[PDB]
Amino acid sequence: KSLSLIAAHSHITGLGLDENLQPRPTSEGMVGQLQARRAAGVILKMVQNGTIAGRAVLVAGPPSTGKTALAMGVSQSLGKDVPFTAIAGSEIFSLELSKTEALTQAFRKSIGIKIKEETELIEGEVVEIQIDRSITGGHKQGKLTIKTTDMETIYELGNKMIDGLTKEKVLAGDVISIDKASGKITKLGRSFARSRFVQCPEGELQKRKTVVHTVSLHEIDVINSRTQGFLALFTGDTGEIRSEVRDQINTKVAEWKEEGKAEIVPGVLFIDEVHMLDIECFSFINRALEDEFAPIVMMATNRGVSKTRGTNYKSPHGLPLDLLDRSIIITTKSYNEQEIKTILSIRAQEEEVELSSDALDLLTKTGVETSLRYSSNLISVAQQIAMKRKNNTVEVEDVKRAYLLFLDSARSVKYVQENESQYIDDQGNVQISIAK
Amino acid sequence: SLIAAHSHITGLGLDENLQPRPTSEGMVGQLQARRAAGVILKMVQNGTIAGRAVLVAGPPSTGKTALAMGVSQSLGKDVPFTAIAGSEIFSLELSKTEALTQAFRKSIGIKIKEETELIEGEVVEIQIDRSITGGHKQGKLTIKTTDMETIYELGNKMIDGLTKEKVLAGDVISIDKASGKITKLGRSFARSRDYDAMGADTRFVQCPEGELQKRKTVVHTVSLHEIDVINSRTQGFLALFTGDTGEIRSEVRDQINTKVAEWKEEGKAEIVPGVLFIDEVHMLDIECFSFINRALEDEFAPIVMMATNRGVSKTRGTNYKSPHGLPLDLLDRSIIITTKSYNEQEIKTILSIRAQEEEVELSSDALDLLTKTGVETSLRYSSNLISVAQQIAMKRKNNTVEVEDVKRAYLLFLDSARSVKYVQENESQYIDDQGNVQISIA
Amino acid sequence: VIERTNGPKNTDSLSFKTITQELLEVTRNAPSEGVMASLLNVEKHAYEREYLNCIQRGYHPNVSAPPVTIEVLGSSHVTNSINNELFDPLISQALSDIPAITQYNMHVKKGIPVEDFPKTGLFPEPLNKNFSSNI
Amino acid sequence: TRTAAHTHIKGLGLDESGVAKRVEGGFVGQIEAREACGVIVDLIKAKKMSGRAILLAGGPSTGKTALALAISQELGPKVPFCPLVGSELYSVEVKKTETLMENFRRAIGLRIKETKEVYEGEVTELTPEDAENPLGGYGKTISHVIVGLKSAKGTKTLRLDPTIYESIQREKVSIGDVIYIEANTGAVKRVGRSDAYATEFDLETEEYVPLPKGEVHKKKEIVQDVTLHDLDVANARPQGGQDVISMMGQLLKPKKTEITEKLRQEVNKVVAKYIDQGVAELIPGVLFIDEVNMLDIEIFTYLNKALESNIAPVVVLASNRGMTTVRGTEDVISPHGVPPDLIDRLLIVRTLPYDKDEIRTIIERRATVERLQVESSALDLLATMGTETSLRYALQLLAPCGILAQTSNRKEIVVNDVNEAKLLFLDAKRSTKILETSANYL
Amino acid sequence: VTRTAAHTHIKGLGLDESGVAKRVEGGFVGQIEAREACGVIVDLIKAKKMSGRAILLAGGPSTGKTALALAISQELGPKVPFCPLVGSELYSVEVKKTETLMENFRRAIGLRIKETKEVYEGEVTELTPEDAENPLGGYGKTISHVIVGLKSAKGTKTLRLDPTIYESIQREKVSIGDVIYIEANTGAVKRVGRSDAYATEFDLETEEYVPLPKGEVHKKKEIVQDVTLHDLDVANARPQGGQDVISMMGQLLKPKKTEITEKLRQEVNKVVAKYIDQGVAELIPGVLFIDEVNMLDIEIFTYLNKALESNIAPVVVLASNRGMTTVRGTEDVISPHGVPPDLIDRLLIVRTLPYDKDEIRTIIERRATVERLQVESSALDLLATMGTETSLRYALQLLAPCGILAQTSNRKEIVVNDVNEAKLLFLDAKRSTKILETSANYL
Ligand SMILES: Nc1ncnc2c1ncn2[C@@H]1O[C@H](COP(=O)(O)OP(=O)(O)O)[C@@H](O)[C@H]1O
Ligand SMILES: Nc1ncnc2c1ncn2[C@@H]1O[C@H](COP(=O)(O)OP(=O)(O)O)[C@@H](O)[C@H]1O
Ligand SMILES: Nc1ncnc2c1ncn2[C@@H]1O[C@H](COP(=O)(O)OP(=O)(O)O)[C@@H](O)[C@H]1O
Ligand SMILES: Nc1ncnc2c1ncn2[C@@H]1O[C@H](COP(=O)(O)OP(=O)(O)O)[C@@H](O)[C@H]1O
């Protein structure tokens, strides 16, 4: 499951830390940024403890300095079964939902209910089905010889089981699972009989299994609101869910928690590029962070002393000071030559690219000259240029050809400022003619 | 119909060598613009190329929309001509790109050839078997001519056609197989016994003779936009009239393009390009120009003719001024036809043609006074004064417009400059830009 | 919508006949070559002129899918309620028709009157025979 | 009897073949504008031109709306007249272009005539006569239906089709009810029960329409007056159908939709076909827009497009601004808030302010319409009051004067009552002086 | 014979086996470095491993930016999906622009699936329904079963319908003597038409006639289907295809765009992963092309920053022609090509260069060859110096009025007097601006 080709943060499998929350120099695909990784590990221990709620953490720094990488590492080290809602800042300006309603849905998607239940199933291999039918179809009789690798039995079947076996046609040689209470019969496949293919089950026929369900609060909010069904969880037209059913869900969840029938898991809400939110969003967040059913909100931004959207003044990080009072700030730093070389080596091993040493030094030099992402993007173009001339190892001139073909930001600005008469300026004046 | 502004223009008035006559088909003057419009007309009539933008620019009251109407009249039938204004793009149901795509796709016709069978015969026997609730309907129809006798089986739609405008076993009707039309030609039997109701006082007609069934190749034109609207959903034919076609997806348009190419390959259907005419194109946003710059490069694109009466002015959606109110990207890929202002002789001939169109007889001195006022003021004012002078002439009971009627119409109805002078002389009487007005006359 | 019946209303009321409802009513059973019917029959004239009943189909959807199945393990009430909602007999009878021999068995052989039948045949007609299926 | 700011004017008041007299029809003064409006009324009654535009301009309290309503009264009640405000075009359901086109199509009327052949009255007998040879496997095969009808001074027995008995059973036609059968369609409808069958039961719901006058069979020629917008909204919406969409939309909110140009073209061609047959008459009318400065330049551009149409009616615009910026533009200075493109396409009628004697005469007519009795010295003081402050302020201070006269148990307004009404109710100038000379947020 | 519109003289990039481009081959003239870079990009797309790579074609107006993207699209072929787009398409009045960008991102990822079909087909011989014990009970339908008899070549079967199947049988209005086609996956029924075993010409409903189907009544067949992920998303968002109530009423309502949630996309991804894991489906990453990228505002750029870091997103190509232009939706910031620097840091910029006189001449020569016209050499030189004087597009678009004016004098060749006449009739932007500046009343 979970198909994926290659991502920009696909080499990161978690925060590289020891048992004392100390960062290794290189572990789980993350190098450098020791203090930020330690602080994110402390935040991970906050999430794993779960005894506190509504704490806001801001990750701020220069662009292309391990912010989204840190968020991806926290999400990978959280594991499965714990909600993680990663949204962008421009995703809440909707046309059918208000900004506060979309923010409320994104807040309530990150708190889960854990419910354990038990059900009994008959998973077996069908030896023989015998069906006795009448002329008019009044009374049906049925014998079912079914087995595992451990037992063997014969069952008399009633009329509704005859109807449920005729529908979704079960033949001899099949492996099926039957639910007695609901009457759901699933064909797992065919057994190992050459005369798809699965293994015949072992042990008892009538098994009792415990399944664990994690249901978000937003799902129960959609279900309890009678105006729309559960298909609004998939189609997306929930449409301004009222606060009365939210109050009923908030009371019933605590009622289940006191009786021990369910458990509370908190999650992480990540807001990438938080500076694009409006002032009314920040004013809503300032009061939504103080609820008992509030997750931990991590926000990432790279702006420095910019204009707050919806106002006319300037604020640090694009955020007003009342929101910044309610947050603790993790600050990232720029990378050195050695860490850039290590990151580029990790990305070379990730994309199955074989690199010479001098090509790696050239990539590190042009990475500390221009950008990390530019050298991270040249490394796969140079492999195709290498494969055009039929050799596996990327050499120095293979990097030089890709450097010549594909430009960066500074060279493009230089060439545009040199030949600005051929481009459209702000005033809309261009020159298309060559002569005169 | 009613007399409109450009009801006197039937064609362009061109020779076989595309040389415009000085006075032909209701158009005088403007030789080079009419020559260029004839070249554009020949380029449309050839149909070889697509996506050429033509711009018509000039001062107000010069003949831009008159030239477009002459092109549309000389275009002939079975070639579409989608003429829209610039402010029709902005809607609350469609986006600007979707509205412009529908305007582009309304200007390409698909000519489809079909085979049909015509049956003309005297009705003999009608047996209609229906269910109890009236849902399932079937039956038989025995029809005859003077030479043969045929029993046909009927469907639901055919029985629905027979039940409307009831046929009564002895009439003469017509049958089209492909169209499903029921047309009662008349009655030949002339029955004596008739019920008090009904009553086919249908005109008498002889019974048809010869072959009952005849084959005919028919042809008909549809637009591409109608094909997309029909194939969009279940009830697209209602949406063709109600206009409730909201944001048709791209997959529908790709499949319709592929099926149109298949119909061209099989010889069933042919493609006839048309003209899309945007009057007052300067009332468009920069996003519309950006969409047009890429929509003009497709194969299924019509010839786009735009009209502008603006000089250097601010482009809508931006904060800089551009020539003709259009960005230089759209001005790069267009060829511009320039119209020029008129003389007194051309204005006199235009007023003579407009007086002949409104069936108003004019004196010579009244025509000279109208020419003088149309030289001083605009042409449209002296054109509008003719009907008022005719009404004043009919009030005094003489069916010939004299000089004093034009003088009285000049005194009664004002110009733009005279009204500006009267407003500027009495500025306290009117509400100014700051909302201050002096109502009291003390 | 389904069991809407055209019951009579008394004259002494404030809800009167708006003009467009009267134009809709005079052309309910009017035949051809009548002036009000011909002024009210634009769409069928456009249908019969443009040869639209013999046209082909140029578009088919790529994927067709049933609604998402909701399952609750260990309860038959949810299965019964889901099967009632998916296959509501009133709506499913409204979107279809009774066979003619079955109707003859209800009305003549069983004594059930016509007005006691469930309402049937409310499905809208497709444009062509070619437009009635995706295959 | 209700009087509201108008209805003291009964037409323009011109004589035939001539000019306006000084006082007639509730009008005092304004001779030249009345003559121009009479010429426009004669042009509208000529029923030939299309899309002519009149802008009448002047100060506040001058009589532009009174002149427009006088035009509407002078035309009569059979010619359509659509009043409108420039602020009404901004709708949040459909774009303003579609609203302007709907108000354009509302102003054109169609007069149709038809002949109906009916049979109505109380049913005397209802016998479905069986056939001579009934078919096997069936029951009660019908050859015809005998229905007897009775009305005032006439009874007549009929002979019907076998088919109508199904409609008789579906419409629940028993004995003693009053039925209605038109000739060509059949289609019996149940209009009610006779009044002679009213008091046999204590409780019932069915109404009792009495016996209809005249004979049972009479051909009646009816004449119906519709508009083109009614035909458009009748053809666009579906008829009574059996589909779920038609019954679902009939119980839902009637949301306005963008009517296409195709439906309008089909409506115009079928209307022209029935006009050429000699059955239908086309009556163009007036579309009146008050305070046209509220329109922005997009609606002005679409007005420029739509005034050159083939079917568009006479449009009358009213405005009172001077040198004002057009709405939607930041730097275009224009007379009356109207851009020069539209200004070039219309004729301007100027209206002039009044003097003291005309103010006194207008106050006299408005007093004699409101059934009031005014003293002469009080009339002169009210005329002086209207000279000093406003004409509308003098007109609106009449009913408090009458109420204060009634409170003192007198039937005549005196000087003391108009002084009390002066002191009680303020005007704009004294209220502005109160606002300027106070500093307590007044 | 054929139709040409501003393109279709371009067939591909036109490179060697080593990626070295020729001077003129494949409809291109010059632009060797850009064509080599586009060939490297095409090879990278064909490698089918990378996700979320972005290049930007930067250059002036009329320099060959759209032509390179169309050449890339024809180099990949119709097998790989290619989604063209304009920057103004993202502003819809039905759904937000972020959802439209996500939709166009998911519309460029294809899938090829081998699918099994269970079919019952043949000619209907008998159709007999049987009735329920009580039909007016309120719960339960009118009938219980329907017996149908299907006859095909070398086979005849008898089936007992579920009434739910019989509703879809009856809705297509089948009868005795009709060839049908029942798909057991969804229950959809196709009425092929009347069998030709009976009479033909006695009908009045323009039907078509089909012989008996070959093979048995019951069949299992393999259909290879091509699809995108967006098709699955809109199929599961608006469910049509089933025989239940909701999927039946979904076909009659007006279609409307909605905000498809991420949970549905993850479920579709899991099902597609299960499909490819079985060896049934094959995934084809594609190309999304956006022309005039400067029309995008800052919110779409900020969402693009997040959307390019996913593990599904395809290769996206952009184009712009602005030097130092402020970003739309912002008030003071000035960035190259109208593209903000935080997205610029994730791109690869490909420069496009202007042409010389001889390149303009041979481009005009190829355009005249493609449009089936004969041009004299002196007229070609006049057109070349005109194209260098004013614009390449003006010299290209004046060829067809030259052809019309050459045809109207009963000639095939285009001469100098014809080019002078086309110069006199039609104007360009510079002469129109010179008329506009020395004008009387905003001419
Ligand atoms: N500590 C790290 N370990 C591994 N990769 C890193 C690290 N820091 C940054 N990167 C790489 O640098 C790139 C920029 O990181 P990211 O945080 O996404 O940018 P920004 O800081 O602008 O959000 C990412 O593709 C990531 O793979
Ligand atoms: N050559 C001509 N023949 C007939 N009418 C003309 C001619 N030139 C101008 N007109 C009249 O002058 C007006 C021109 O205005 P219009 O057609 O809107 O185009 P433009 O706005 O470009 O001048 C029209 O109303 C038309 O009746
Ligand atoms: N010539 C006139 N004769 C009589 N009453 C008039 C005359 N002109 C205006 N009035 C009265 O003045 C009042 C306001 O005039 P109005 O028509 O509203 O002017 P405007 O429309 O320019 O504001 C109306 O109630 C009308 O009765
Ligand atoms: N190398 C070339 N060979 C042939 N034609 C070209 C070449 N470069 C550009 N063109 C032509 O120039 C025109 C403008 O190119 P296009 O990329 O569509 O617009 P822009 O360059 O302004 O983005 C196109 O119609 C194309 O046919």
Tab-separated table of C-alpha atoms in Angstrom, chain C residues 90-134:
chain	number	residue	atom	x	y	z
C	90	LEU	CA	-41.391	3.549	-2.876
C	91	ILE	CA	-38.648	5.424	-4.743
C	92	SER	CA	-37.496	2.344	-6.687
C	93	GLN	CA	-41.102	1.696	-7.700
C	94	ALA	CA	-41.448	5.361	-8.685
C	95	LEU	CA	-38.390	5.213	-10.964
C	96	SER	CA	-39.685	2.182	-12.894
C	97	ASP	CA	-42.864	0.522	-14.174
C	98	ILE	CA	-45.047	-2.505	-13.423
C	99	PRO	CA	-45.350	-5.138	-16.196
C	100	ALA	CA	-48.640	-5.174	-18.077
C	101	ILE	CA	-49.638	-8.755	-17.227
C	102	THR	CA	-48.879	-7.975	-13.572
C	103	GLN	CA	-51.141	-4.903	-13.783
C	104	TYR	CA	-53.864	-7.073	-15.318
C	105	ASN	CA	-53.452	-9.485	-12.400
C	106	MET	CA	-53.801	-6.650	-9.864
C	107	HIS	CA	-56.773	-4.886	-11.418
C	108	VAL	CA	-59.020	-7.622	-12.809
C	109	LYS	CA	-58.037	-10.832	-11.010
C	110	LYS	CA	-57.466	-9.260	-7.578
C	111	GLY	CA	-60.011	-6.424	-7.467
C	112	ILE	CA	-57.475	-3.679	-6.711
C	113	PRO	CA	-58.607	-0.363	-8.261
C	114	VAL	CA	-56.427	1.776	-10.504
C	115	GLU	CA	-55.945	4.628	-8.007
C	116	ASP	CA	-54.666	2.220	-5.324
C	117	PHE	CA	-51.599	1.399	-7.429
C	118	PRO	CA	-48.198	2.728	-6.350
C	119	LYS	CA	-47.018	5.640	-8.464
C	120	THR	CA	-44.778	4.457	-11.314
C	121	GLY	CA	-43.025	5.761	-14.410
C	122	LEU	CA	-41.422	8.944	-13.076
C	123	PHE	CA	-38.043	8.378	-14.767
C	124	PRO	CA	-37.205	11.057	-17.368
C	125	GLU	CA	-36.911	9.958	-20.971
C	126	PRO	CA	-33.461	9.953	-22.600
C	127	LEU	CA	-32.798	11.949	-25.748
C	128	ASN	CA	-32.204	8.947	-28.043
C	129	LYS	CA	-31.958	5.198	-27.827
C	130	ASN	CA	-28.189	5.726	-28.073
C	131	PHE	CA	-28.155	8.045	-25.036
C	132	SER	CA	-29.828	5.541	-22.694
C	133	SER	CA	-26.671	3.612	-21.756
C	134	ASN	CA	-22.922	3.990	-21.298
